[PDB]
Design a binder for this molecule. Structure first.
Ligand SMILES: Nc1ccn([C@@H]2O[C@H](COP(=O)(O)OP(=O)(O)O)[C@@H](O)[C@H]2O)c(=O)n1
Lengths: 154, 155, 154, 154, 158, 157
């Protein structure tokens, strides 16, 4: 709907280890989405447990958290029209076995537990994840020189 | 059967030109095996754009669509190859980028349907009409690709 | 999609070699996380190609298919990884490029089904047969990728 | 050095035949130069003889004219600060064997007689070549949305 | 010439507002990633003028000082720290000559930039100025400690 | 000086670090895009005796045993490329042997840092290419074919 919608995109430790930061950022940049926050971070366990709160009563929660502590994460906020849903489509199916070539996971990933990246699955979950991973001051307000060539309206 | 000398009209719209997508879009068609037979950077007159979009003349956003298509240069192209009309449309991706797939031009580069960076003919007969509208017949260059027999098994 | 040591046979056909697509095709499998365990440029004899296409021996186009595959070099490969047979075919795209999706090898590079740039084994059992036909066993190279544990969940 | 300097860049028939139109355009696009005219053409022999009139006594002249007639040419006018000199640097040394990897000829070409592209060698020669290859109404006046991010001033 | 020999050398690389505006974050990061260098800190930031004036303290006697600061205020900056052998000097070589007119195709500025006042990126010019810039642009806890899985394939020695 | 024979051949190897770091495709593409013709290729883990022969000129050096041990530590993508001046131009494409001295735009200037992890090898002379080609490949593994675009890459035979 509105061009100022925001989503949380994270490059997971395997994506960082495998040297996929540049290519993944380029996918969103090239689409016309606007990077409004980014940091390389190794978040505390409590923050990862909150991010994965929906999985805390599911099997093998401890192992997920330990894996996500095992390397740096490139955390990002991207902004644009339908960026939540379109970002998920750019990432590709969450399990790379089901993803399409031309998406991030369809180009770079094989195992669902090593699926390179995360994207918010809804507008409301995006707002929650952005608040969890970023201080408000870390969200940078700016206007792209090509805004009116990417968008026909606000 | 489909013949390898089918032609389609592909245009890079002003937003495509402004956002520096000329090279990447041409590469998509080149790499697939299609043959560039005509190309020109053009700022066509309003009357030609209104003819191109005559199917939409009675819509209210017509005046604004034509105004946007006048707002910058256009890279007009004719591409030739087997099923190039249909496959060209697939390469561009869904007309509305919201519905397009990553790996297509719009799925890689575009967001808004009104800023969908390119155009492709939607049928062989519409391609013929668009080619006659945007090009003089002498602007179509006859030539044979050195790899024709490696792209095509017949025709 | 079971064991991470599944193997498939991928060949770049004469038209793929002629059109300079060796690099790009290898990069697609490399970038996905699959492991190259065998490779050679080869112009195999007619009898090998007839054996490769043995399941088509009673089709009328058999002789013409064999003759075309003799018309230039072939880059023969074995790739290894989880679900590499089926995912490999997905990466190649639909056998007929007219039905293939942009983002796949054929959806990016090919038009005619008889000039579809590449081949990949269609089943695990056919992959084992094709690997045994195109490579000597000592041509399969045993090695472990430095990023194995970032591509695959332990 | 004004930012409205213009140069003539042509992709020669070998560049067209070998599928290098896209990549060569991207090199100039990516650098920040502005495409102001472009057409695919098969110019008459007279125009090519005028284009290479200074070499009309050189031995490779008539063979050059014949090869320049042997396929389409992608003729272009590019605009920007020091675009004549920097454009030649982007093309690389006239003889590709003396050119640097990272230039067009250093990435794509081998023989000086098959060196993929032409670029004007001086501001005055650019003006002459633009007048020879283009009608003035084929040069398109426009303003790049990122002009103020490519240039500090005009 | 002389090159560094310590694999834990660090440099500060910034993508300037024009590089962010022109969509070059991904390509520039890929250049350093592809070379084998390790990203140890990164953030998108619009720093205050006081920090930019400190960043350019070595140029505070130059006539272009004020304009340089004002320009760096004009949009977001992708600030980064990269780690690896000779990363200060090799990082500058990857960026290319500071003035893009003098830069070579195949470098960042040789591929992407024209005007020195819009030269897309910055790299520390010395080991000591890298130390200063790293500490100026990043809080100490924003430097991330990790070990690249391919370290022993990028480097032959410690 | 540059070679003038279009059937010159050189030996290019992607070293174990090039293979490990996923550079086979990009490296092949550099030579493919330049117009050179691939006439032989195989993934190989050669025996120590062959690597010792390949580095015969360094058998006296103190790092010889370690250099051999490292070249044994992973697979190698061995190739023969054919074209005009392919030996010298091939080395230029690879970049300076020490990546620290190489230029961005070359293979080592894009991908490598340490001279002992410089991702690839190219023959340093026409004669050493002939020797390396014969050392790394059986004669029947060199493939005879004619590129569809030969006459567009080359102005003369
Ligand atoms: N030994 C030589 C030297 C020059 N040439 C010519 O030098 C040209 C270089 O391209 P160009 O004329 O469009 O550009 P410049 O000569 O201004 O660098 C070749 O394409 C040929 O026109 C040749 O064919 N053989």
């Amino acid at each position: 709907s509105m061009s100022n919608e925001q989503t949380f995109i994270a490059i997971k430790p395997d994506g960082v280890q495998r040297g996929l930061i540049g290519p993944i950022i380029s996918r969103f940049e090239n689409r016309g989405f606007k990077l409004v926050a980014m940091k390389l971070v190794s978040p505390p366990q409590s923050q990862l447990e909150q991010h994965y709160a929906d999985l805390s009563d599911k099997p093998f929660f401890k192992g997920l958290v330990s894996y996500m502590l095992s390397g740096p994460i490139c955390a990002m906020v991207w902004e644009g029209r339908d960026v939540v849903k379109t970002g998920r489509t750019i990432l590709g199916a969450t399990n790379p076995l089901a993803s399409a070539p031309g998406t991030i996971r369809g180009d770079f990933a094989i195992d669902v537990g090593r699926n390179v990246c995360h994207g918010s699955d809804s507008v409301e979950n995006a707002k929650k994840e952005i608040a969890l991973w970023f201080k408000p001051e870390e969200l940078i307000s700016w206007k792209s020189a090509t805004f009116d060539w990417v968008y026909e309206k606000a």
